[PDB]
Amino acid sequence: ATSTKKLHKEPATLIKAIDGDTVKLMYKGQPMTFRLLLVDTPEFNEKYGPEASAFTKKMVENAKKIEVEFDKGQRTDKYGRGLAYIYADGKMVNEALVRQGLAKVAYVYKGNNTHEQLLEKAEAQAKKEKLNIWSE
Ligand SMILES: Cc1cn([C@H]2C[C@H](OP(=O)(O)O)[C@@H](COP(=O)(O)O)O2)c(=O)[nH]c1=O
Ligand SMILES: [Ca+2]
């Protein structure tokens, strides 16, 4: 029996926060726009959009340490964005959004589903707490 490498976190530096689920980072010395895996925040012009954007922006701008964690499948989307879990001082932004009710679990592809159950747990707690997108 053999194994594959576990997921691992790589450093990156903030260039700018874009919206609730998109952030531009300097990764291995080149700019890359990352789309957060497994999540969908409202668009800025939709209900809770601004709040989602602001939550991510604050999380990434206040972080001393940002990390990128690719999953085991596709690394880029069809628009060229990197697909990753993003951590800010050890806290997963993807998870934090979902837990706050500012993102839905979404875009769940079996190739890239490592934190599916973690995020579904967060979503269930956000729904029970009637936060944000779940408030009605
Ligand atoms: C999260 C994620 C998004 N996407 C793409 C699909 C959506 O484009 P299509 O609708 O053209 O398929 C797009 C949504 O991005 P935004 O939610 O940033 O608007 O993100 C992936 O392809 N893979 C993924 O894992
Ligand atoms: Ca979105």
Swiss-Prot record:
Residues 115-136 are annotated as: Disordered. The active site is at R35, E43, R81. It is found in: Secreted. Residues 115-131 have a biased composition (Basic and acidic residues). Ca(2+) binds at D21, D40, T41. Transmembrane segments: none annotated. This is Nuclease A. The gene is nuc. The chain holds residues 83 to 224 of 231 of the full protein.
